[model samples]
Target: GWLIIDMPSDRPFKQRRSFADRCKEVQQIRDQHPSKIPVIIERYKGEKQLPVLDKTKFLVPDHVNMSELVKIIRRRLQLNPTQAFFLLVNQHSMVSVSTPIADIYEQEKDEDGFLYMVYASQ
Candidate 1:
């Protein structure tokens, strides 16, 4: 995703003390946007589909319970409680059925159906 900032043309530009200072200011603003949090998006090539994890055979860590996951999404993504709950619940249901049992940690799906996991890790 790209960050789109529309700065007003009439805004005055105050001269910063140094290049490092200007860099720090930009970095601070970028940090405030949760989606901008550093992450790697690895794209795969070729027709071979990635493997999926089975929901029934897999389990989230004790520390990464549903409540905790919801909390993280709500706080980081600024989603309302209801929105976060529904989003997580819907995703969980879809992923549970689409994931394969052999590889439990993989996140994503390569097929579409009644039980499809469309969204991958953010």
Candidate 2:
């Protein structure tokens, strides 16, 4: 099992920056491999709009700590944690580990807010 980190945030700019950075880093690493691994960027959009939170959300589930999380994910995914960590660390500059609101929001919000979330796979 992989470790998931949950970092909670309330800013949209921060969330966007984090997502962009992560996506770019992942792309950069994928470019070096002989076989191009599929990288999926899932966006949340719906008919009903919802309000955002004040702080970014972060989550690290499965492992007891970040070190263990990295080890497990690397083993299962066949990825070098050192390389993957670089990408993740770069992306992390923009956002923190947390659950995304789009995945959890039940009722709608009135004002602008952001939800930040991420997970690791092994």
lDDT of 1 at 22: 42
Residue 85 local lDDT, model 2 = 30
Best by TM-score: 1
lDDT of each model, Cα atoms only? Answer: 0.30, 0.33
TM-score of each: 0.24, 0.22
Instruction: Name the runs in model 2 displaced over 4 angstroms.
Output: 1-63, 80-84, 87-91, 94-122
In candidate 2 the C-alpha lDDT for residue 17 amounts to 60
Model 1 lDDT, residue 34, Cα: 22
Model 2 global lDDT (CA atoms, 0 to 1): 0.33
